Design a protein around this ligand. Structure first.
Ligand SMILES: *[C@@H]1O[C@H](CO)[C@@H](O[C@@H]2O[C@H](CO)[C@@H](O)[C@H](O)[C@H]2NC(C)=O)[C@H](O)[C@H]1NC(C)=O
Lengths: 49, 49
């Protein structure tokens, strides 16, 4: 008898749920490929371990 | 109660739209009126105009 008050709450929560994944994708999916460092660590004395 | 819910939702959406508009205004100011140096702000790659 309270109408469709439920649907908007469900919709808003779903929107937040999608927004979180959108944020993660935007902030990290910045490179189209995958690179790997060479096994040799000869960087003129610079250490990145 | 229904009207209150609608008003609150509209206010939040308006805030989001204002943020988007501010970003758009900065983009128009920098990527169009001149040559930008920030990378990926005015499209992928080196920006020209
Ligand atoms: C890069 O730095 C790491 C430490 O951050 C070095 O690892 C150390 O190596 C010495 C001897 O090989 C050990 O006694 C230490 O216990 C190691 N520390 C750690 C945290 O593992 C590593 O040798 C450095 N590599 C280069 C090429 O400089």
């Amino acid at each position: 008898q309270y109408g469709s008050f439920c649907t908007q709450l469900n919709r808003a929560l779903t929107g937040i749920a999608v927004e979180q994944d959108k944020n993660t994708q935007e902030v990290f999916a910045q490179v189209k490929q995958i690179y790997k460092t060479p096994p040799i660590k000869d960087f003129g004395g610079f250490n990145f371990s | 109660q229904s009207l209150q819910t609608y008003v609150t939702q509209q206010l939040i959406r308006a805030a989001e739209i204002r943020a988007s508009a501010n970003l758009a205004a900065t983009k128009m100011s920098e990527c169009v009126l001149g040559q930008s140096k920030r990378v990926d702000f005015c499209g992928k790659g080196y920006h020209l105009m």
